[PDB]
Amino acid sequence: HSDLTFCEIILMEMESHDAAWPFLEPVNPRLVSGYRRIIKNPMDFSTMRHRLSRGGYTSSEEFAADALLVFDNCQTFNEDDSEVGKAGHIMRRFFESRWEEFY
Ligand SMILES: Cc1[nH]c(-c2csc(N=C(N)N)n2)c2c1C(=O)CCC2
Ligand SMILES: Cc1[nH]c(-c2csc(N=C(N)N)n2)c2c1C(=O)CCC2
Ligand SMILES: [Mg+2]
């Protein structure tokens, strides 16, 4: 239980973060040329919230795998100096920081 209560805290804090704006909803590939071709496993915060709401996370490491996927995808598709890239570096460092001060 205490494994997933920490996930609720960190997801809530990511959802409300100023830099979370790129990651609150699935990328719409109709709007982003090449996204479906390049990103094989899309992930975003609303999909994590939904899976957390169903309890579809066995452990905290599965939750962290999805979170890291959000930022691996971001770094794969976006230049580090792009608007989305810069936001994902902020969010990734935030996640990494909060994660290790729980484990
Ligand atoms: C993870 C991610 N979120 C968004 C996004 C949300 S809202 C918005 N609106 C713009 N850019 N005007 N872009 C993108 C993205 C990518 O990885 C590729 C480019 C677009
Ligand atoms: C060029 C461009 N890409 C996006 C975008 C990518 S991904 C996403 N996420 C959704 N649709 N949930 N929006 C937008 C955009 C605009 O010009 C203004 C509207 C939003
Ligand atoms: Mg480190």
List the helices and strands and how they pair.
Elements: H1 2-15, H2 35-38, H3 45-53, H4 60-77, H5 83-100
Helix pairs in contact: 1-3, 4-5
The chain binds the ligand Cc1[nH]c(-c2csc(N=C(N)N)n2)c2c1C(=O)CCC2 (2 copies) and magnesium ion.
One copy of the ligand Cc1[nH]c(-c2csc(N=C(N)N)n2)c2c1C(=O)CCC2 binds at residues 25, 27-28, 31-32.
Structure description:
This protein is mostly helical. The chain has a single domain (1-101), classed as Bromodomain-like (Histone Acetyltransferase, Chain A). Helices cover 61% and strands 0% of the residues. The chain contains five helices and no strands. It has helices at residues 2-15, 35-38, 45-53, 60-77, 83-100. Helix 1 runs antiparallel to helix 3 (45-53) and helix 4 (60-77) runs antiparallel to helix 5 (83-100). The two termini are 14 Å apart. One ligand GQX binds at residues 25, 27-28, 31-32.
